[PDB]
Ligand binder design. Sequence first.
Ligand code: HEM
Ligand SMILES: Oc1c(Cl)cccc1Cl
Length: 137
Amino acid sequence: GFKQDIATLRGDLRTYAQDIFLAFLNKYPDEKRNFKNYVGKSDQELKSMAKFGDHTEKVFNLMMEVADRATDCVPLASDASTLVQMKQHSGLTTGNFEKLFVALVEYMRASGQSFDSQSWDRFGKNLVSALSSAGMK
Ligand code: HEM
Ligand SMILES: Oc1c(Cl)cccc1Cl
């Protein structure tokens, strides 16, 4: 289920964080609007790079903590507030977060593995709702 999937992802976090964020960028190419340093790069080029590997892993590290601190796939209001009030998220709308979670759930369904994709879909919905409540547009 959801907890075990946090353990699975954390067990190979660099690889999963890169693969899921490339799935997001390829599914939603307009989302490179928030990442100008990533335009005109193939996935292997993006991986080779330092900002990429570092920011992707730090994003997934914090996403797994927010997942871990959730009850029944409902994140803490404190975690949503933090995500809304991060300077690096000044540009962002809940739509950016929805897209990331759609890509995450489609990655999990396509994997050969027994991820609880319905729980991740619920978690993404619930985080978007929490982000709205914490004051993201
Ligand atoms: C739950 C989902 C997300 C989490 C946990 C998260 C977390 C973080 C973290 C920890 C950083 C700092 C990374 C560092 O220190 O280098 C960061 C930066 C950033 N995030 Fe998010 N983020 C999430 C979703 C998103 C989405 C959906 C977007 C855009 C579509 C986004 C755009 C950015 C950008 C542009 C930066 C700045 C570049 C950087 O410093 O890495 N994030 N995010
Ligand atoms: O690689 C990144 C990710 Cl995965 C999220 C936000 C910013 C960057 Cl640079």
